[PDB]
């Protein structure tokens, strides 16, 4: 049956870092001494992971409630758990967690894992009560309290063998995905010591099972082992040393990754092609180490943030133009324009070109329209391609430092993406003190009057170098 | 097993033959390899253009 526990009271979260964890073998291929580039669902490097304690002893004298909130499941979950007494037992997967929608129960009880995909009537607080005997302390009695009723299953797995029930903490990491009706569970196990949060390190995850589910999952829940008595909750020590066991949750995200396979075919290192400029250059060169110089990584273009339509001020259902509403007109901003059916993108400006009374367009190069006349308010306005360029990454060698500078070629940088609040690194703070050069806008490097035999050639007589504590500077080269 | 499992006649090695392993077709000489596949892997590609290794369904050689 089901037994009610005290209300969760919506405890405020506490967060922690995920230092480069959660890289699993994406495919079923063997590679050796190859640096292979992949794109899939991964946990981003250096991400927020929210961590819950098993039993929150809120009062110093003792509180003995469970922390098992229902959390969203958005295209996969990285779930790590550190414990020393086997306190978490399993997970509940579903969409509504009632009798209306099918649900997966993966909890193990004392005997086996009992993977059960059925229609469960789940209660509010699921758990498995384990009681040490207060006298003999030899038999640990276990009683599940998960589902009131289970009906008409589409799957079942059981395990025949039985499994047995002060700082020897152990770390179990899992990744759950749902692709093409297949529930993929990847797993990994590792001993640890004297690390309360997620330790610094890397660990590839080996696929464990691909379960043919074919249902939807959107929410999931964690089931815990209740050491104490709900009928008679004790004052203290009823739980396991104040809910020491803990579990961390993070959400995957579509990302590319440069993945390093060693000689044995075991993944050992990884690199985010969307974390900071150095990593983008690493992915572009298809190597983990880069030498000093200037590398062109990608291209930058301003996107049109709105659309405008100007249709003639006559009904007539070109004069047979279809039914569409002519919106207002904007200027000095890269927009998508549609003038009398003529579509394009650009920035519009007031034009001084004296149009003759019968002319409509204007073209200087014979394949691009330069100016235009608005059909409703007949004013001449010219069109310019708003912006575009290439992004180069000034860097000294990867031995020296991981500081870089970014140069947008041949563009003003009163319009480079700034003050931002996906790799949204841009600047979002003018603490770099960008400054224009004839070659474009250079962001992240200092200006210095001193002149030296310039090492990294930038352009227009400007070269950059790494100087001593130490950072990047840009200066006009001297000839000696 | 599922659907209709078929047969393969025999297997020959050290001999340039036309081979079809689980639908992967080609020509080549098959030889015993000392590479150690991980338990969940099927084929390998050290060159990034051609699968230089393959796992035999009958015997995991």
């Amino acid at each position, epitope marked *: 049956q089901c037994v009610n526990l005290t209300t969760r009271t919506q405890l405020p979260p506490a967060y922690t870092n995920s230092f480069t964890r959660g890289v699993y073998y994406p495919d079923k291929v063997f590679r050796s001494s190859v640096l292979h580039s992949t794109q899939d669902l991964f946990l981003p490097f250096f991400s927020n992971v929210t961590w819950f304690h098993a039993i929150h002893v809120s009062g110093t004298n003792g509180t003995k409630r469970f922390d098992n909130p229902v959390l969203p499941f958005n295209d996969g979950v990285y779930f790590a758990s550190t414990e020393k007494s086997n306190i978490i037992r399993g997970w509940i997967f579903g969409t509504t967690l009632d009798s209306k929608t099918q649900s997966l129960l993966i909890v193990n009880n004392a005997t086996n894992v009992v993977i059960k995909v059925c229609e469960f009537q789940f209660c509010n607080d699921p758990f498995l009560g384990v009681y040490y005997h207060k006298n003999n302390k030899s038999w640990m009695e276990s009683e599940f309290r998960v589902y009131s009723s289970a009906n008409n299953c589409t799957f079942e797995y059981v*395990s025949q063998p039985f*499994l047995m029930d002060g700082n020897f903490k152990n770390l179990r990491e899992f990744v759950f995905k749902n692709i093409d009706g297949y529930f993929k569970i990847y797993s990994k196990h590792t001993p640890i010591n004297l690390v309360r949060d997620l330790p610094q390190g890397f660990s590839a995850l080996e696929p464990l099972v691909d379960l043919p589910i074919g249902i939807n999952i959107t929410r999931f829940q964690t089931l815990l082992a209740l050491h104490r008595s709900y009928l008679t909750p004790g004052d203290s020590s009823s739980g396991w040393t104040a809910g020491a066991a803990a579990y961390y949750v993070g959400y995957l995200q579509p990302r590319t990754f440069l993945l390093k396979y060693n000689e044995n075919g075991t993944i050992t290192d990884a690199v985010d092609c969307a974390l900071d400029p150095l990593s983008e250059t690493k992915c572009t060169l298809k190597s983990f180490t880069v030498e000093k110089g200037i590398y062109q990584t990608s291209n930058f273009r301003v996107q049109p943030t709105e659309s405008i339509v100007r249709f003639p001020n006559i009904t007539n259902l070109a004069t047979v133009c279809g039914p569409k509403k002519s919106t207002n007109l904007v200027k000095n901003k890269c927009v998508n324009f549609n003038f009398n059916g003529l579509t394009g993108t650009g920035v519009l400006t007031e034009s001084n070109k004296k149009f003759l009374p019968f002319q409509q367009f204007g073209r200087d190069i014979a394949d691009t329209t330069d100016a235009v006349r608005d059909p409703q308010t007949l004013e001449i306005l010219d069109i310019t391609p708003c912006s575009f360029g290439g992004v180069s990454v000034i860097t000294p060698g990867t031995n020296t430092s991981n500081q870089v500078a970014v140069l947008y070629q041949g563009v003003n940088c009163t319009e480079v993406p700034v003050a931002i609040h996906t790799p949204t690194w841009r600047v979002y703070s003018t603490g770099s003190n960008v400054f224009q050069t004839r070659a474009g806008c250079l962001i992240g490097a200092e200006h210095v009057n001193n002149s030296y035999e310039c090492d990294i050639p930038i352009g227009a007589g400007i070269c950059a170098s790494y100087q001593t504590s130490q950072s990047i500077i840009a200066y006009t080269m001297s000839l000696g | 097993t599922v659907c209709g499992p078929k047969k393969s006649t025999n297997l020959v090695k050290n001999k340039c033959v036309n081979f079809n392993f689980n639908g992967l077709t080609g020509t080549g000489v098959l030889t015993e390899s000392n590479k150690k596949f991980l338990p969940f892997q099927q084929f390998g590609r050290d060159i990034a253009d051609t699968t230089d290794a393959v796992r035999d369904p009958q*015997t995991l050689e």
Partner: nanobody
Amino acid sequence: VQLQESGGGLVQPGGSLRLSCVASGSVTFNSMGWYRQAPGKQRELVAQITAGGDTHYADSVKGRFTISEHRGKNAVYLEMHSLKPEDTAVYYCHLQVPFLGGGYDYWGQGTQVTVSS
């Protein structure tokens, strides 16, 4: 899929054989198991070897079956001898891969063996 295991020859009462678990690669384990099952009856636990060396055996197979391991090719062998018609069944080898404390063993790959005159 993961591992694989099949093959074995028919024998007559009093014969001998050495069943072998097909080398599937390096895999983490702590107990290699051998089950036996025939139609009309349940699977039964026959022979267990622990990574440490514990040798569990059913009462019906005492003194006739020998279980051993070879880590060079990572295969566990069961020598079956002094055979009787009660051994007509399929034999299944189950692995130990830990899951959530332990689960999903790998007995699905089996071999059919019939002991008759």
